[PDB]
Structure 1
Amino acid sequence: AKNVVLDHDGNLDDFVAMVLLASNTEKVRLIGALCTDADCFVENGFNVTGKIMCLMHNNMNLPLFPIGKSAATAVNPFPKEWRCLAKNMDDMPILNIPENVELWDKIKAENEKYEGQQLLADLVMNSEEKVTICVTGPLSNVAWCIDKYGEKFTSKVEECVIMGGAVDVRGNVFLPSTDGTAEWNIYWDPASAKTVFGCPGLRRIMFSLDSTNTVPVRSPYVQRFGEQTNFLLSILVGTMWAMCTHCELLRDGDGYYAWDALTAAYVVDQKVANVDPVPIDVVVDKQPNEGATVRTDAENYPLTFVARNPEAEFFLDMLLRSARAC
């Protein structure tokens, strides 16, 4: 197995990503997680991370790992309605089984001490083998580590597998002030994304909307978790997906996708997608396309490996199988 740190922001797919990483122990050793106050309220995202970890630890092969709240602050905050989802999950019966929340209350004090950005730096820098960072929220934490530690940090990163951006397709940030070309994780903190995408000697894999658009969360697939209710993880994953199957009803053709789950699936098994090198820059200016990830023809600019044409069925099967881990 390879060392992985999950750098997430506590939406539903972030937690599915966590389940994927934590359940595939032969491929992934999940050595830590951090939660950013972006697409969640960080207190809730933190507690849900702990509750999921404890559920899994108490029912399967999963060493406990440190969980930190990131100090990162928004440039452009997420909509409040989207940030609420970790609050809902914090209250879900599946995440509040007595033995699991007992464990979480016992191990919480240690985890409360951490600051997520420093934790990310430490886990990466202090690991014997290189660490893969699975980034499923904004890029603020990776940028903070690059800024503070430079090559001392980046040399220890195997690769950074990032959910974010939109290269050859429209974005998903649709605000009166925006032109729709930006994707939300980048838009939340464009300057940090720019630092990450421009960093030489950091290997980056990018799951932009170009690839994640192929995995909308659809009812028939979600209902398959109902076939697996003997498994706690299937109740968990299926519940989280069931909470997003209406989004396409609200936003025609623009619902919820397994964005972060596909990203984590690639960390588990790179057969999830082939990747193409693209030099990626980020618009940081307060223009309508703030946060857009754009190709740059700048000489000697670092490459980012953009996922294309993912193996959607392989991914969907991986998740259904992984959710039978307990």
Structure 2
Amino acid sequence: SAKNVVLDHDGNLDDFVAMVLLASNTEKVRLIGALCTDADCFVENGFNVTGKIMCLMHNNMNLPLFPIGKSAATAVNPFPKEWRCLAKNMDDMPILNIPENVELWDKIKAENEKYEGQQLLADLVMNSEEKVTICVTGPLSNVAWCIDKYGEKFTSKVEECVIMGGAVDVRGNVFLPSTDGTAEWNIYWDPASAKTVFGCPGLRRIMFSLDSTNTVPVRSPYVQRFGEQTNFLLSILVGTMWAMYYAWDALTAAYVVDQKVANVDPVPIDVVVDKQPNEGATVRTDAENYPLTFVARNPEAEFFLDMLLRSARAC
């Protein structure tokens, strides 16, 4: 029996590949909602692309429709302008603008525009009958808001949080004049929210930090293999997105589909929030009784790559 999942993303190409993985694997995942954050994307574009992908899938593989909410979360440290656009251009991609699918999105657009992402995440998790897995592929601002505002009443309903973020025993990817390169972008965007999430007791966390995502880079030959599947809408979609980096978010969602993707190691993780060169770094803390986070280790690359090619044949 599939398990409930909510995708908490920030609308970049990798977030959409993660969405396709979650959505296409209906035997393992029941996608009950998604929210988009104005981090590594312009939220209005991320919102529309999420909607267009969902409708395309609903009309071609019977994927049940779900609510989509734009989060009000604001950045502590903004992503570079040169990223963010991507979702914008994807909104104009032909495969996401087939009339039957756009017509459906335009019909349900208005009601989805009434949702605010943070509240939607809280509600989906707290009103679900069974527990909910949250796949976070953007900053941790929304899960943090839910923890801060609902506490145990929210966390008790979470199966686990599978998070793309951080860098534990490897360097990060935030290279600015004022940083030391040890922090990763999703955490650096909002360190305090990340700290709240990683230090929260009673919350199970699976963390795909750069330690693991670095081992599965996006290479041209593999991407070109989607050309073997152009009769499938999702292969045209995924291939196009990766043809435009590592499989950061996709690996995270792959684990939600099947934990065989990677084994984990328990690590107590704190986040640096002071304005230091390593602001945003996820570090091992020595604090007594500090909650553990299960950090992904040695991901199964071949298994993941095959999973994505297969998932892209759902329709």
Normalising by the residue count of structure 2, what TM-score does the alignment of the two structures yield? 0.99
List, as ranges, runs of 4+ consecutive aligned residues in structure 1 with deviation greater than 2 Å: none
Partner of 1:253: none
Cα distance between partner residues in 2 of 1:61 and 1:283: 44
Cα distance between partner residues in 2 of 1:286 and 1:102: 48
Residue 258 of structure 1: CA displacement? Answer: 0.6
Q: Return 5+ residue gaps in structure 1 as ranges.
A: 244-255
Cα distance between partner residues in 1 of 2:172 and 2:103: 42
Identity of aligned residues (%): 100
Residue 177 of structure 1: CA displacement? Answer: 1.0
| Aligned 8 A contact 1:233 1:324 in 2 | yes
Partner deviation per Cα, 1:124-161 (whole Å, 9 max, x = no partner)? 00000000000000000000000000000000000000
Cα distance between partner residues in 1 of 2:214 and 2:95: 29
Partner of 2:47: 46
Q: Structure 2 matches for 1:1-326, cutoff 5 A?
A: 1-243=2-244, 256-326=245-315
| Aligned 8 A contact 1:25 1:61 in 2 | no
Residue 271 of structure 1: CA displacement? Answer: 0.2
Partner deviation per Cα, 1:97-138 (whole Å, 9 max, x = no partner)? 111111111010010000000000000000000000000000
Cα distance between partner residues in 2 of 1:141 and 1:98: 33
Q: Return 5+ residue gaps in structure 2 as ranges.
A: none
Cα distance between partner residues in 2 of 1:202 and 1:56: 32
Partner deviation per Cα, 1:194-242 (whole Å, 9 max, x = no partner)? 0000000000000000000011111000000000000000000000000
| Aligned 8 A contact 1:3 1:31 in 2 | yes
Cα distance between partner residues in 2 of 1:150 and 1:163: 22
Residue 170 of structure 1: CA displacement? Answer: 0.3
Residue 86 of structure 1: CA displacement? Answer: 0.3
Residue 88 of structure 1: CA displacement? Answer: 1.1
Residue 184 of structure 1: CA displacement? Answer: 0.1
| Aligned 8 A contact 1:190 1:282 in 2 | yes
Cα distance between partner residues in 2 of 1:193 and 1:154: 15
The DSSP-based 3-state class of the residue aligned with 1:58 is: helix
Cα distance between partner residues in 2 of 1:97 and 1:289: 46
The DSSP-based 3-state class of the residue aligned with 1:80 is: coil
The DSSP-based 3-state class of the residue aligned with 2:269 is: strand
Residue 61 of structure 1: CA displacement? Answer: 2.8
Cα distance between partner residues in 2 of 1:275 and 1:57: 34
Residue 50 of structure 1: CA displacement? Answer: 0.3
Residue 94 of structure 1: CA displacement? Answer: 1.0
Residue 72 of structure 1: CA displacement? Answer: 0.1
Normalising by the residue count of structure 1, what TM-score does the alignment of the two structures yield? 0.96
